[PDB]
Scaffold this active site. Structure first.
Site: not given
Ligand SMILES: Cc1cc2nc3c(=O)[nH]c(=O)nc-3n(C[C@H](O)[C@H](O)[C@H](O)COP(=O)(O)O)c2cc1C
Length: 364
Positions: A181, A300, A274, A228, A97, A176-177, A321, A179, A22
């Protein structure tokens, strides 16, 4: 090449294991999916390939980027249907998503310029800056910490948006769970300072994601729901004191939802940092081994790293991505071991419907 070994992702028969991760690209002007998104996803769709859309708003308060699509209005559903139809004409599977940014927003993105919502009243610190509609970088504001009734209404926004995604023809949705948010603002003990039943213990901090996932499972069926998370990514001041333990607590909740519902989710999708390599890999493998179902790894990956992940049993599917931004035919390039083309970061988030979006060429 084990990336080209077929995989059954519940009801979906995939022909290969290369997944479009996504990605927010900000071409959905005024939050309405545009024709350009149709061309972009069609270029990347392959027969039996799995695609996940850019994060999509679940409500008018859920955005923190310009020109991201929503799926909370019937106009948005109508326009998404046109995009889903062109992807399905190529035989691809596509999930939408569902994304709420919580405190990672700004007045410019909020109705009536109200404060963004969160688990907490604390702002993201000025170590991080928000992309503004004019291309400058702004300051994240103080969010408003929501009560439990408001939490339940956010859950109902996810439920309604999941049903809207099915109405547009999507095969399923991804929560989307990750990053930093909204969901991660409840999961991470570096953010969640609540003293009610959604804060403190691991069980309490996992209540929100469990309730979101259960609501969408009840509405559309577990096999149409992916989840996610990113326990080991600290984006937007989202650190946990024990990332592995937090990840394992989420995984136990997902296993429990599956046992209660009599079905498996479509997948668990984890993005890794990474930074290191052996410790990061071990954490990924520990979450994968703990989860009763399909595991998508991300962050990555290259052709060789994705081959290794599947061949070693570390993941069932590999999402890409940035390489998919610049290689619309990434799947074919991976199959042929053809050289990959670079991506141009300067046009990741611009509004042009073509430039840096649909004008990266296919193999000659
Ligand atoms: C421009 C861009 C936008 C992205 N937007 C999202 C998003 O909307 N939702 C999400 O879960 N991750 C998003 N990501 C993270 C990607 O899904 C993915 O995890 C990451 O790109 C994988 O690493 P790779 O680029 O090395 O393959 C985004 C990444 C990029 C570069």
């Amino acid at each position: 090449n084990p990336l080209f070994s077929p995989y059954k992702m519940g009801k979906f028969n995939l022909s290969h294991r290369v997944v479009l991760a996504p990605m927010t690209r900000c071409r959905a002007l005024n939050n309405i999916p545009q024709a350009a998104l149709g061309e972009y996803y069609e270029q990347r769709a392959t027969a039996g390939g799995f695609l996940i859309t850019e994060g999509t708003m679940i409500s008018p308060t859920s955005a923190g980027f310009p020109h991201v699509p929503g799926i909370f209005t019937k106009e948005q559903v109508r326009e998404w249907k046109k995009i889903v139809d062109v992807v399905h004409a190529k035989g691809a599977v596509i999930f939408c998503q569902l994304w709420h940014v919580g405190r990672a927003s700004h007045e410019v993105y909020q109705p009536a310029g109200a404060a963004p919502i969160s688990s907490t009243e604390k702002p993201i610190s000025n170590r991080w800056r928000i992309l503004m509609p004019d291309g400058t970088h702004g300051i994240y504001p103080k969010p408003r910490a929501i009560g439990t009734y408001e939490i339940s209404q956010v859950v109902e926004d996810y439920r309604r948006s999941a049903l809207n995604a099915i109405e547009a023809g999507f095969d399923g949705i991804e929560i989307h769970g990750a990053h930093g948010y909204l969901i991660d603002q409840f999961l991470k003990d570096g953010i969640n300072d609540r003293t009610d039943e959604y804060g403190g213990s691991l069980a309490n901090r996992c209540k929100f994601i469990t309730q979101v996932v259960q609501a969408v499972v009840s509405a559309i069926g577990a096999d149409r729901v992916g989840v996610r998370v990113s326990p080991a990514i600290d984006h937007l001041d989202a650190m946990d004191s024990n990332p592995l333990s937090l990840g394992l607590a989420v995984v136990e909740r997902l296993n429990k939802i599956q046992l209660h519902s009599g079905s498996k989710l479509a997948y668990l999708h984890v993005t890794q940092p990474r930074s290191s390599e052996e410790e990061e890999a071990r954490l990924m493998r520990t979450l994968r081994n703990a989860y009763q179902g399909t595991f998508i790894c991300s962050g990555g990956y290259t052709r060789e790293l994705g081959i290794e992940a599947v061949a070693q049993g570390d993941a069932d599917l590999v999402s890409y991505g940035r390489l998919f931004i610049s290689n619309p035919d990434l799947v074919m390039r991976i199959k042929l071991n053809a050289p990959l083309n670079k991506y141009n970061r300067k046009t990741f988030y611009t509004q042009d419907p073509v430039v840096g979006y649909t004008d990266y060429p296919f193999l000659q």
